[PDB]
Amino acid sequence: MTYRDLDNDLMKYSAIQTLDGEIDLKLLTKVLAPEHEVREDDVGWDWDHLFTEVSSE
Amino acid sequence: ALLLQSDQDNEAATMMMADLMFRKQDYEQAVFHLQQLLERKPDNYMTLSRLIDLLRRCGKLEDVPRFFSMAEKRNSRAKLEPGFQYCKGLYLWYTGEPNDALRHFNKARKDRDWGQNALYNMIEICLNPDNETVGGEVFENLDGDLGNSTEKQESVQLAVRTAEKLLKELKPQTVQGHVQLRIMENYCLMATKQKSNVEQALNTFTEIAASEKEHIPALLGMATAYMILKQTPRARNQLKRIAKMNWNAIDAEEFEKSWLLLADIYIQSAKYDMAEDLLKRCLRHNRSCCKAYEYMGYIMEKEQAYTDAALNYEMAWKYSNRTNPAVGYKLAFNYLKAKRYVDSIDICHQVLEAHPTYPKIRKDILDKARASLRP
Amino acid sequence: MRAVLTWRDKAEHCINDIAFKPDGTQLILAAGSRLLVYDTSDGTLLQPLKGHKDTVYCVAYAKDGKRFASGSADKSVIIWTSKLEGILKYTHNDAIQCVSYNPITHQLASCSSSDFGLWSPEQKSVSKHKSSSKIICCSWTNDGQYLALGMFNGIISIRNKNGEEKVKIERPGGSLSPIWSICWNPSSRWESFWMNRENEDAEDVIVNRYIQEDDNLEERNDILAVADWGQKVSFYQLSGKQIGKDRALNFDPCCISYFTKGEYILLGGSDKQVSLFTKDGVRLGTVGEQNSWVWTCQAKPDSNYVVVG
């Protein structure tokens, strides 16, 4: 791996961390849950299943 | 002791006391006091990274994973933290995985403490990913089947020319930071092997050495630039100059590198006794050093001590994580010559496991060891 | 599947081959430069037998339980009575490798680097017959009529009881895959042959002497286990035809071996264990795993015990 290939770990998240190239917000960003756990679906819940799922985690 | 009596949880006093125990060679106490501090404070990347280097210098890296697990048990998010990522990046550089070390350092690299220290170790790998004596004639005359290829040359020189970008990410806050930055930018200029860049590097190193006559990272710069310039007699004295000095924990890596480069030059001179002294002095400050053992195993094979050569090659095989098939060959070959044909065949399997299609070994070692096995 | 260590010992030297008395009462071991005699019940070592000069590379023991053969790096072969005296010495062309008595006639074979030396009991001569290659391992057909030889050259070849060569198979790759042991399956009518004895006395001699100097094979039922250092095991008929497919491994195998029953296989090697298999070469389990390479795994007569070297 090159330096550029490693830098992909930081490249996308920088747009949330940083404002106008002048400010860095990283201390606040510690509160964020990651996008793939924050995303939601147009899918239904039923109490027996929803309880079973929340109990299985 | 007074500070620890006034507050037992003062981390700086525990670590300073552990460093003094280490200087007094009470390494077991130095370890145990940092282990106690981690059992009070499992999430403590300073105490952890100090303990990791104590365990590297002792040669006891196998003890480390406990303390990562303790941080993960206390704090499930510890894996996300730049100090964990720095501590993990250090570990993989010592186990033998430079790519995984780079991956974990990269995840830390922007942090004001852990990222600054990660960046220096990314620069070490990006300068020298095989951890060689830069310009060492015992081994830079070898590896030619890869070292003559554009594939190894261009990818390594891109890593050198981008270590300058990692150095542009090392914003300094002190004159010592500016000097160490300028030295490592000039190590990038050395590593290009382009004569004007190497002469500029030599000039910055000699200017820094003229301002500070004991500045070891600049003196190693002079020696390395002079070796690349083929001015090997000028390198030799500038390394002897370093070799007379007492060691310290800050210059330690440039000390350990300088002793290895001087030991190579002593092998070129055939005065192996001064090389063995430098290799053993290097191991006394850091028992982990694979290059200190690999040079010593080569001396044992030159001396026809195929058993002690196999002991050095076994450490080099183990601490390469079995990724050095040249030591793989040498270890199998030394077991063959030691009349240990089963052990030779064990290693010929481990080399073919580590690298399929690896040349020479199958016919010469493996089939001659098989052919002896019942005579 | 469960396996229990009944007893253990360690010799002074490496252990090269293993022999059992047919009633299972004594174990004999080719350790370094002497023969060692053991009780199978608890591992007491009764006697180091002294006759050889150099490395005892193997021992094997005849179906009547009166005589055993042992072969050395000093080029000798010695025939020992079960009175543990060496009544008939012999001296081959080069170092001995494997030796094997015939199930039926008590005719012996003794392999070496080029030459294999057949003789039938107390005749005055030995057929020192020639080979293309180093003759690593040897095994008689279950009816006694063919001696099959495995070669370091990766060939198995089949010789009749007179020493003529009748069939060959080459492992694809040749000397890449040395044949380090082979075994004919015990599973035919002849296994009870010599299973009825109650003789209460033995032969005795003053001092140790010297001995001087085939059709319709597809209808022959025998099956040969082949273990090669290409790291594969496969089964073969006397016709030279392969049965099914090569049962692959991840080690250099040694001493492919069977119980008296012919239904389960033992397989030792550079896996440093004794693996257990069906007669189809499917794995079933693990007998005790080991500190070092396994050269030998011999199932006890009439019973489920195993011994390892």
From Swiss-Prot, chain A:
As a component of IFT complex A (IFT-A), a complex required for retrograde ciliary transport and entry into cilia of G protein-coupled receptors (GPCRs), it is involved in ciliogenesis. Involved in retrograde ciliary transport along microtubules from the ciliary tip to the base. It comes from the Eukaryota. The lineage of its organism: Eukaryota, Metazoa, Chordata, Craniata, Vertebrata. Changing residue 45 to R: In SRTD18; patient cells show reduced amount of IFT43 protein and do not have cilia. The gene is IFT43. Component of the IFT complex A (IFT-A) complex. IFT-A complex is divided into a core subcomplex composed of IFT122:IFT140:WDR19 which is associated with TULP3 and a peripheral subcomplex composed of IFT43:WDR35:TTC21B. Interacts directy with IFT122, WDR35 and TTC21B. It is linked to Cranioectodermal dysplasia 3: A disorder primarily characterized by craniofacial, skeletal and ectodermal abnormalities. Clinical features include craniosynostosis, narrow rib cage, short limbs, brachydactyly, hypoplastic and widely spaced teeth, sparse hair, skin laxity and abnormal nails. Nephronophthisis leading to progressive renal failure, hepatic fibrosis, heart defects, and retinitis pigmentosa have also been described. Expressed in the retina, predominantly in the photoreceptor outer segment. This is Intraflagellar transport protein 43 homolog. It is found in: Cytoplasm, Cytoskeleton; Cell projection, Cilium. Belongs to the IFT43 family. The chain holds residues 130 to 186 of 208 of the full protein.
Swiss-Prot record, chain B:
GO terms for molecular function: chromatin binding. Changing residue 245 to V: In JBTS11; hypomorphic variant in vitro. TPR repeats lie at residues 11-44, 82-115, 256-289, 291-323, 325-358. GO terms for biological process: Bergmann glial cell differentiation; cerebellar Purkinje cell differentiation; cilium assembly; forebrain dorsal/ventral pattern formation; intraciliary retrograde transport; negative regulation of eating behavior; positive regulation of canonical Wnt signaling pathway; positive regulation of gene expression. Keywords: Cell projection, Ciliopathy, Cilium, Cytoplasm, Cytoskeleton, Disease variant, Intellectual disability, Joubert syndrome, Meckel syndrome, Nephronophthisis, Obesity, Repeat, TPR repeat. The keyword Transport does not apply. Changing residue 162 to R: Found in a patient with Bardet-Biedl syndrome; probably acts as a disease modifier; the patient also carries two mutations in BBS6; hypomorphic variant in vitro. One of its GO terms (cellular component) is cytoplasm. The keyword Glycoprotein does not apply. It is found in: Cytoplasm, Cytoskeleton, Cilium axoneme. It is linked to Ciliary dysfunction leads to a broad spectrum of disorders, collectively termed ciliopathies. Overlapping clinical features include retinal degeneration, renal cystic disease, skeletal abnormalities, fibrosis of various organ, and a complex range of anatomical and functional defects of the central and peripheral nervous system. The ciliopathy range of diseases includes Meckel-Gruber syndrome, Bardet-Biedl syndrome, Joubert syndrome, nephronophtisis, Senior-Loken syndrome, and Jeune asphyxiating thoracic dystrophy among others. TTC21B is causally associated with diverse ciliopathies. Belongs to the TTC21 family. This is Tetratricopeptide repeat protein 21B. It comes from Homo sapiens. The gene is TTC21B. The chain holds residues 942 to 1316 of 1316 of the full protein.
Swiss-Prot record, chain C:
WD repeats lie at residues 10-50, 51-91, 93-129, 131-169, 248-287. It is found in: Cell projection, Cilium; Cytoplasm, Cytoskeleton, Cilium basal body. It comes from the Eukaryota. Expressed in many tissues. Predominant expression in testis and pituitary. Component of the IFT complex A (IFT-A) complex. IFT-A complex is divided into a core subcomplex composed of IFT122:IFT140:WDR19 which is associated with TULP3 and a peripheral subcomplex composed of IFT43:WDR35:TTC21B. Interacts with IFT43:WDR35; the interaction connects the 2 IFT-A subcomplexes. Interacts with IFTAP; the interaction associates IFTAP with IFT-A complex. Forms the trimeric core subcomplex IFT122:IFT140:WDR19 via the C-terminal region, whereas it interacts with IFT43:WDR35 via the N-terminal region containing the WD repeats. As a component of the IFT complex A (IFT-A), a complex required for retrograde ciliary transport and entry into cilia of G protein-coupled receptors (GPCRs), it is required in ciliogenesis and ciliary protein trafficking. Involved in cilia formation during neuronal patterning. Acts as a negative regulator of Shh signaling. Required to recruit TULP3 to primary cilia. It is linked to Cranioectodermal dysplasia 1: A disorder characterized by craniofacial, skeletal and ectodermal abnormalities. Clinical features include dolichocephaly (with or without sagittal suture synostosis), scaphocephaly, short stature, limb shortening, short ribs, narrow chest, brachydactyly, renal failure and hepatic fibrosis, small and abnormally shaped teeth, sparse hair, skin laxity and abnormal nails. This is Intraflagellar transport protein 122 homolog. It comes from Homo sapiens. The lineage of its organism: Eukaryota, Metazoa, Chordata, Craniata, Vertebrata.
